[PDB]
Symmetry: C3
């Protein structure tokens, strides 16, 4: 399309929401291509990632870890206004894996504190894609400090299974998984720092061991458990988007399954079906579709159980509805062996 043609397309401004929720959108595209505008501010701030008060200097899109999920349709143009407040201390940029050219846009969006930039790119391929900060010479550091998220480019006709059957979800959740590398002092205790830059040297050496100290969903151990559990009802169809910008993960819905799973996260690649545990390589986003059939609590985890239960990669789903004894029943409840 020409500049004039693009300038004549209808525009739509979207207000982003904090994960795990997603901004309002329609699954089937309404009309022709549009220019969808999003705005994000970068915040460098301290966040507490566990119940022991462990602090990390996060670098976060819209102040959250992960950054928010953006949704557009294939062939729409995504126009992002990115702002780096004058009160931040580092240069930042953004690389969209969904985009084509200039290192995903990273080479055209380098902004120092006090600057802003506006990038537009055509969303040519459908699927869920990772986006993350990637400043020359400090790439992994900004990423493992939480500066990453994902976007979803829906086919204009919505989701379909491998044989054209339409798949409409009632709810959608976005789980961003993050590997953190927190330095410890000679006593085995987590160190604290004044400014982000003061934690750099120590962080890099932990990073080089390739072993994270924490692996969490939505920015903190237990961030998605208890009262903050994701919800659904028996019969509801749910789409769970999962991203990991730096490290492999293996999602699994304990008590459930992945009915249709785009493990590679790309919609033109037929989904795998009936999955127990799927795999998402570091630097990618994946999506799983599931229809709940039983009520109760479900654990959604990274299935390397040490990472899930010892490092923090575990979330909950609280589902309401009626129990189906055909699917599963306790014939004899736990009881003493009668001698």
């Amino acid at each position: 399309a020409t500049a004039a043609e693009i300038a004549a397309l209808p525009r739509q401004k979207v207000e982003l929401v904090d994960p795990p929720f997603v901004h309002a959108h329609s699954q089937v595209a309404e009309g022709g291509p549009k220019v969808v505008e999003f705005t994000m501010v970068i915040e460098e701030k301290k966040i507490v990632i566990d119940d022991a008060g462990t602090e990390v200097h996060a670098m976060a899109f819209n102040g959250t870890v992960p950054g928010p999920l953006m949704v557009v349709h294939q062939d729409d143009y995504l126009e992002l206004t990115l702002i780096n407040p004058e009160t931040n201390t580092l240069m930042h940029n953004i690389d969209f894996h969904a985009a084509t050219g200039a290192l995903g846009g990273g080479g055209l969006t380098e902004i120092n504190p006090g600057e802003k930039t506006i990038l537009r790119f055509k969303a040519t391929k459908p699927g869920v894609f990772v986006y993350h900060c990637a400043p020359p010479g400090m790439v992994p550091w900004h990423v493992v400090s939480g500066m990453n998220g994902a976007i979803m480019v829906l086919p204009r006709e919505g989701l379909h299974d491998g044989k054209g059957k339409a798949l409409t979800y009632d709810k959608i959740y976005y789980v961003g998984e993050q590997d953190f590398y927190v330095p410890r002092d000679e006593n085995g205790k987590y160190k604290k720092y004044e400014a982000p830059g003061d934690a750099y040297e120590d962080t890099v050496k932990v990073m080089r061991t390739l072993t994270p100290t924490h692996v969490v969903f939505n920015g903190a151990v237990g961030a998605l458990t208890g009262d903050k559990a994701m919800t659904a009802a028996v019969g509801e169809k749910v789409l769970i988007v999962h991203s990991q910008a730096n490290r492999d993960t293996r999602p699994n819905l304990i008590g459930g399954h992945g009915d249709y799973v785009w493990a590679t996260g790309k919609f033109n690649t037929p989904p795998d079906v009936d999955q127990e545990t799927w795999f998402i390589p570091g630097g990618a986003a994946g999506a799983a579709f599931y229809t709940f059939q039983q009520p109760g609590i479900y654990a959604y985890v990274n299935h390397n159980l040490i990472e899930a239960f010892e490092l923090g990669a575990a979330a909950h789903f609280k589902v309401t509805g009626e129990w189906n004894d055909d699917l599963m029943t306790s014939v004899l409840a736990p009881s003493g062996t009668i001698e």
Copy 2:
């Protein structure tokens, strides 16, 4: 189905066998749905995992690591009687990834020493699935102490390739891969303990490094080599089921291939073909079908060769038959360069 309908289905009691062998079963389902009954006892016992006398306090279904493979057909009901002897010391339960609801059955099967329980669930999805113990607050510990196995839910019509062609195996083997985390003393030697509970604190810290000390098949280094090598003959069709309840693995048949591989382990997902090395994420089971064409010894390994040859993840296949020179021949045997 209603309670009355399920109670009227024919019942079949199965006697489980120790891995790598599998209990007798038919590939094609005989008649209508049945209730298949299995019984497992939990044993907490010390096992020796290498040739240096390294001991670990195992927690094992039917006394083996991995637990035995259970086979049913899609839509059959699996009814398990699980027994925790009064002489054990910990609470245990079971979570079937093949099941739907109550954390895979884990929430309905918590039993203390001296108790038993009976769980029934409908095997609605075909494929190989992991099952493992998962007691609240001690999940990874029971799993990496060997309390896991797999089940296979065969399509009622048996296995088929991606285009409907039937695939009948002559033999089937089950290889359970286990990551162990054994604590070492200030001298670098493996520590020993009196009771399972006494090794907990030390084990957890090794677990947190995410680096296993041993990665073995069938419970011990060399468990499936030498005289205990799995066997086959040229022309025979073999199905190899492989599971890893906690950590990624990458199976490879050295000298052979994976003709048809359900790397995700789910039969409704077409298999990948002609594989050299396939990948099974932690928390999943996979299956590979191969027809031997050459006799001799084959090495079946986790292809991170350090894990295979240094940590223990290597097994053997001894195949009988006639050599095929068309497929491979030594034109000039190793010999001195004639100067």
Copy 3:
């Protein structure tokens, strides 16, 4: 085929070239099956892998790491002459994952310094496959010392996508990824050794931590950057073959995509499409096809960004051509917020 029939097939001698380039070949097979002859010499030599002068005693096919890529067509016979000079110190052999029998040929090609051997095998399955040294009792050590490469067995009719559409590449590059495990002294500095054998004991203990000190493409940090960047032009179709003989990797073309990706590396398995980051398990080779649409520099990396930017797994692509503003444009260049 019989011995006489094979002896009557036309023969073709190929001169191998150093990676990342590939020897001349035709994508579509010309005529009937042939016997393709290749010759490789093994060199045990010291190579420098980073800019800090870190030395490693490499074991390399034709003196390079990775060894060169060999290309044949399905059903061709590959006949390799392998030479171990009298000046080397260790026994070596070769295992082709593309071959069937005798541990990939490893059991028929064990040669001491001063010996040579000639092996022939039929290339029955199409796809890219790993090949590596694997001497009994020292398998992982020869592999992580760089003694591995890959071969490509093209379908006789050339590459096709999932629905029969032909895929012809203008250029092909071979990126061999290598995990190195270099021992450090009590001061944290990399140790040096006189002979390969003198570094063995120390290397094995680093290997057991399963954590590499370097992860590089084409044998050294920055080997494929700057003036040695791989090249292409907008509109050109490029095939990138990637192998890792021992450890998982997750390739990603920053700024681009994997239009068609055979992540398992086997051509009879339909490719995944529109990939951002793909996964290649250790012990396998994969291939990605991409048509450049934007000029500029692209980074081709292992997307665990710590491994890419801290350990060395990063290469460059320099692409010429005209910028496409429809695909991406800087609407507002980085500029100060006007207060």
